[PDB]
């Protein structure tokens, strides 16, 4: 299809169009990307991802068209600790994507350790919300929590300082304009605190014509719950 839209105001346990990978599962009408114990507390060493089953037509070579897209979603992070890890990310990747071996912790379940920073070895665009930046393990991160745009690498091509607020929902709007090639990210807390970061990228030279969209989250030795609360997505092929 030239256009596709779907909306999850909430996440009932009765799902048919979601691909669950790793420890991701539905709980309390929300998607718990990372594993939690009996009483609902986050645990260490866990990775989880979900992908919408239907493939998205990002660009069409024959017609020379590129899709414009918009992903709106909200999530919250909670942890008994203070410095919870590792973060949640919205990503777009080839349809057959799976969790890479050893992609836990700071790799957010998106990259393989050996190729995490090799751009020519990956096919992924992700918008990460990174809460852990210890320079001993996450050498690629600036030293402060942040939102980043990742293009084939765990080392963001662009970042903005971000504030982690335990148990507070973050509203996010991600949009890609094929006419200007800008991928814009707008994130805001209920009180109006706003964060913005954008980057110009030609998706055609990064991803195949058909892709899949979803979320990924992980917790290494440090942990926190990565709760996806709602999600709407729409894509339309356009001639620029």
Ligand X SMILES: CO[C@H]1O[C@H](CO)[C@@H](O)[C@H](O[C@H]2O[C@H](CO)[C@@H](O)[C@H](O)[C@@H]2O)[C@@H]1O
Q: Is 84 in the site for ligand MAN (CB under 6 A)?
A: no
Q: Apex CA 85: angle with CA 87 and CA 127, to 5°?
A: 15
The sign of the torsion formed by the CA atoms of 77, 79, 83, 88 equals negative
CA distance 219 to 186: 24
Output the smallest distance, CB 217 to Ca ion, in A: 12
Map 169-224 to HEC letters: CEEEEEEEECCCCEEEEEEEECCCCEEEEEEECCHHHCCCCEEEEEEEEEECCCCC
DSSP annotation of 114 reads G
The C-alpha atoms of residue 84 and residue 166 are separated, in whole angstroms, by: 9
CB atoms inside a 10 Å sphere around CB 165: 14
106 sits near Ca ion (criterion: CB under 5 A):
yes
Cis peptide before 86 (omega within 30 of 0): yes
Considering the complex, what minimum distance in angstroms separates the CB of residue 69 from its own copies?
13
Say whether residue 220 binds ligand MAN (CB under 6 A).
yes
- The span from the CA of 184 to the CA of 198, in Å, is 4
Q: How far is the CB of 35 from ligand MAN (least distance, A)?
A: 13
Looking at the Cβ atoms of 132 and 199, the one nearer to Ca ion is 132
- Partner interacting with residue 191 (select from its own copies, Ca ion, Mn ion, none; CB below 5-8 Å by kind): none
| Complex with Mn ion: residue 23 or 141, whichever CB lies closer | 141
233 is in an annotated binding site: no
Q: Is 138 in the site for ligand MAN (CB under 6 A)?
A: yes
Tell whether residue 176 is a contact of Ca ion (CB under 5 A).
Answer: no
In whole angstroms, give the CA distance from residue 3 to residue 40.
38
Q: Is 146 annotated as a binding residue?
A: yes
Asked if 179 and 240 touch (Cβ cutoff 8 Å), the reply is yes
Q: How far apart are the first and last CA of the chain?
A: 18
Among 130, 159, 187, 235, binds Ca ion (CB under 5 A): 130
Our CB check for ligand MAN shows the closer of 224 and 227 to be 224
> Out of ligand X, Ca ion, ligand MAN, none, which partner does residue 130 contact, by CB within 5 to 8 A per kind?
Ca ion
Decide which of ligand MAN, its own copies, Mn ion, none touches 8; Cβ closer than 5 to 8 Å per partner kind: its own copies
Of 102-110, 121-129, 202-210, 229-237, the segment contacting ligand MAN by CB under 6 A is 102-110
**Which residues are near its own copies by CB under 8 A?**
1-9, 12, 14, 16-17, 53-55, 57, 60, 62, 95, 209-210, 234
Binding residues for Mn(2+): 128, 130, 132, 141, 146
Q: Which residues form the interface with ligand MAN (CB under 6 A)?
A: 85-86, 104-106, 132, 137-138, 219-222
């Amino acid at each position: 299809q030239d256009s596709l839209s779907f909306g999850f105001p909430t996440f009932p346990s009765d799902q048919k169009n979601l691909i669950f990978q790793g420890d991701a599962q539905i709980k309390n009408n929300a998607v718990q990307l990372t594993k939690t114990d009996s009483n609902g507390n986050p645990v260490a060493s866990t990775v989880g991802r979900i992908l919408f089953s239907a493939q998205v037509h990002l660009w069409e070579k024959s017609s020379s068209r590129v899709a414009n897209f918009q992903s709106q979603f909200s999530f919250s992070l909670k942890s008994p600790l203070s410095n919870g890890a590792d973060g949640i990310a919205f990503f777009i990747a080839p349809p057959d994507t799976t969790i890479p071996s050893g992609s836990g912790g700071g790799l957010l379940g998106l990259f393989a350790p050996g190729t995490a920073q090799n751009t020519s070895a990956n096919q992924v665009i992700a918008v990460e919300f990174d809460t852990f930046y210890a320079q001993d393990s996450n050498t690629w991160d600036p030293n402060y929590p942040h939102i980043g745009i990742d293009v084939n690498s765990i080392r963001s091509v662009k970042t903005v300082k971000w504030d982690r607020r335990d148990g507070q929902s973050l509203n996010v709007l991600v949009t890609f304009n094929p006419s200007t090639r800008n991928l814009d990210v707008v994130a805001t807390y209920s009180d109006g605190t706003r964060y913005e970061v954008s980057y110009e990228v030609d998706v055609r030279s990064v991803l195949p014509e058909w892709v899949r969209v979803g979320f990924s989250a992980a917790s290494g030795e440090q942990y926190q719950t990565h709760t996806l609360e709602s999600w709407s997505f729409t894509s339309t092929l356009l001639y620029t």
